[PDB]
Amino acid sequence: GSLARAGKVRGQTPKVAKQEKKKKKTGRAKRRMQYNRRFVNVVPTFGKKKGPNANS
């Protein structure tokens, strides 16, 4: 019908800048930190709630 509205929402969206953050980790040390975060000093916590990226 009409090609006039195209790129509408991507152009209408307020361009928020990417905030800076530190370097992540790579390789053996990244696998090390995600092994620690899951199998040693995992928090003894609420039952069955281990649903990480749990936003409430």
């Binding site: 039952g47 069955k48 709630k49």
Partner: peptide, 29 residues
């Protein structure tokens, strides 16, 4: 509450999410 969420929303759009949250609550993890 995953039980109440499941019993309320099992027919709606959010049915698979509340099913997954109920199964997470039930089968440990």
């Amino acid at each position: 509450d995953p039980y109440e969420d499941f019993q309320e929303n099992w027919n709606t759009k959010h049915s698979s999410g509340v099913t997954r949250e109920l199964m997470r609550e039930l089968n440990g993890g």
